[PDB]
Amino acid sequence: GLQEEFEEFAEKAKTLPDTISNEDKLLLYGLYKQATVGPVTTGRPGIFNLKDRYKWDAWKAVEGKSKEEAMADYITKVKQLLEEASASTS
C-alpha cells in the first residue's frame, strides 16, 4: 500500500509545474533518495560540483527519517504541491 502509493506520487511529481521553488525541488529529491536508498553514505561531492553538492546536502538534511517515514513525507509533500497548484489555476 505505502510503496504502491509512493510510486504513484513519484509519477505525479513528474507532472508538477516547474514554477515550484528550488527549495521544494531539493526537498522532494532528498525525500525521494531517503525513502529508496536510505541515509546517504556517499561522500560529499567536490567543492565545485555544486549541482550535486546541493542535491547531496538536501539528502543529508533528512538522514534522520526512516524509509517508510520518508515515503509518507514525500507523498505528503507532493500532495501539498498538487492541491496548491490546483488552487492557483482557474
Curated annotation (Swiss-Prot):
Gene3D superfamilies: 1.20.80.10
GO annotation terms (biological process): fatty acid metabolic process
Tissue: Highly expressed in leaves. Expressed at low levels in roots and seeds.
Source domain of life: Eukaryota
Main location: cytoplasm
Coiled coil: none
GO molecular function term, any single one: fatty-acyl-CoA binding
Keyword Ribosomal protein: no
Database matches in Pfam families: ACBP (PF00887)
Annotated positions binding an acyl-CoA: K14, Y29, G30, L31, Y32, K33, K51, K55, Y74
Keywords annotated in UniProt: Cytoplasm, Lipid-binding
Places the protein is found: Cytoplasm, Cytosol
Stimuli inducing this protein: Down-regulated by cold stress, wounding and infection with the rice blast fungus Magnaporthe oryzae.
Domain ACB: 2-87
Membrane-traversing stretches: none
Gene Ontology cellular component annotations, sorted alphabetically: cytosol
Described purpose of this protein according to its UniProt entry: Binds medium- and long-chain acyl-CoA esters with high affinity. Can interact in vitro with linolenoyl-CoA. Binds palmitoyl-CoA and linoleoyl-CoA in vitro. Binds phosphatidic acid (PA) and phosphatidylcholine (PC) in vitro. May play a role in the biosynthesis of phospholipids.
Family in the record: Belongs to the ACBP family.
Protein name: Acyl-CoA-binding domain-containing protein 2
Organism: Oryza sativa subsp. japonica (Rice)
